[PDB]
Amino acid sequence: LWDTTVRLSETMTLECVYPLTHNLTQVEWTKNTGTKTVSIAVYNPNHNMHIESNYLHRVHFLNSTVGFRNMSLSFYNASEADIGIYSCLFHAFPNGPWEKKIKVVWSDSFEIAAPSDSYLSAEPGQDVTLTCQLWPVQQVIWEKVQPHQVDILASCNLSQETRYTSKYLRQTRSNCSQGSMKSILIIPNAMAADSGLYRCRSEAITGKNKSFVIRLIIT
Amino acid sequence: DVVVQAPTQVPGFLGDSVTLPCYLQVPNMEVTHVSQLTWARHGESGSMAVFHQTQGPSYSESKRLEFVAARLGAELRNASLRMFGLRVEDEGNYTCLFVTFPQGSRSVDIWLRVLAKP
Numbered sequence: 001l002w003d004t005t006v007r008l009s010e011t012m013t014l015e016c017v018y019p020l021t022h023n024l025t026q027v028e029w030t031k032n033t034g035t036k037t038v039s040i041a042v043y044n045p046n047h048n049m050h051i052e053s054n055y056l057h058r059v060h061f062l063n064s065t066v067g068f069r070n071m072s073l074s075f076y077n078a079s080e081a082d083i084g085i086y087s088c089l090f091h092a093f094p095n096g097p098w099e100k101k102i103k104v105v106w107s108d109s110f111e112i113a114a115p116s117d118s119y120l121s122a123e124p125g126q127d128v129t130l131t132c133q134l135w136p137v138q139q140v141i142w143e144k145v146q147p148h149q150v151d152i153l154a155s156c157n158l159s160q161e162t163r164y165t166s167k168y169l170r171q172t173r174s175n176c177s178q179g180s181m182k183s184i185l186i187i188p189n190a191m192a193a194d195s196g197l198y199r200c201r202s203e204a205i206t207g208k209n210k211s212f213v214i215r216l217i218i219t
Numbered sequence: 220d221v222v223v224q225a226p227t228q229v230p231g232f233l234g235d236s237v238t239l240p241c242y243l244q245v246p247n248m249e250v251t252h253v254s255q256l257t258w259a260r261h262g263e264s265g266s267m268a269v270f271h272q273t274q275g276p277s278y279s280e281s282k283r284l285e286f287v288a289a290r291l292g293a294e295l296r297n298a299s300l301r302m303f304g305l306r307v308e309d310e311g312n313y314t315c316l317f318v319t320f321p322q323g324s325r326s327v328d329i330w331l332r333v334l335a336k337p
């Protein structure tokens with residue numbers, strides 16, 4: 001339902017970078033209230049940047065350059081009304097749409113509820129393998145936990161419907177195996193930027209959920 | 220506002236060719252610019268058919284799909300797509316999407332139903 005969860009703050013930024021090489025046709029930001037779509041911004045290379053009147057003095061684009069590959073949505077002064085699920089939708093030829101869904105919630109630092117269960121370190125330049133140490137498990141999620149946001153790196157599932165494509169910009173290798181096994185996440189050619197908290201979330205059919213948190217350190 | 224018009228269901232027989240109609244309704248006084256049309260199968264990774272205002276058509280497999288009403292040098296308003304040689308795996312829901320400015324994207328879902336023989 002969402003690819004990234006960000007913590008509500010005054011000048012929060014909803015990160016969205018197009019990761020494909022296709023030339024953009026149009027980019028749009030929208031927000032789902034409960035079931036309806038408010039248009040926030042629309043950019044097309046044949047026109048000027050269009051921001052709806054309801055958001056003209058509420059959001060702006062800080063980390064963009066020509067072409068607008070980075071369409072991150074920064075807020076001037078974000079309020080309770082900005083809580084919800086946002087949609088960053090890139091359109092291109094001939095690939096079509098590339099969508100990223102960002103859920104804005106009210107919370108404290110996400111690292112508080114994610115204490116480290118293991119300390120893994122590795123030298124820069126190696127393929128780090130994060131093995132998750134977690135009948136009737138249904139869904140498995142790999143995510144990187146930061147104080148301001150949580151990014152889903154991998155979402156595996158056996159029975160139900162999902163071939164989840166990670167919208168995380170950094171390249172990671174996931175395995176959605178069928179023998180219920182040690183869920184691993186591979187960080188190819190890990191650098192110092194890949195350091196942080198990586199959480200393995202297993203969700204069973206009972207509603208039970210268990211978390212295993214690995215703190216990765218790349219000196 | 221700009222609204223996509225399409226039926227909820229399109230029936231077709233096994234082995235026949237069927238056309239999924241999908242049109243963009245825009246009021247006579249409202250200005251809009253449609254950049255490209257996109258068909259996607261509900262439950263897949265990417266799109267199966269795209270028509271760009273300048274680049275023309277593109278299909279996941281060119282032999283099975285065809286934009287029957289989209290044409291270069293004309294207003295992109297009709298995204299109707301014909302599917303050739305219906306097989307049982309073509310059964311499902313399909314998304315017809317219009318990329319418009321400045322209104323944004325408008326989409327609708329169409330249930331393609333493949334019928335068996337007598």
Ligand SMILES: *[C@@H]1O[C@H](CO)[C@@H](O)[C@H](O)[C@H]1NC(C)=O
Nearest residue numbers: 238240241242287288297299
């Ligand atoms: C759109 O194209 C389909 C395919 O032939 C056609 O049946 C339909 O009448 C067209 N709609 C409009 C409004 O022209």
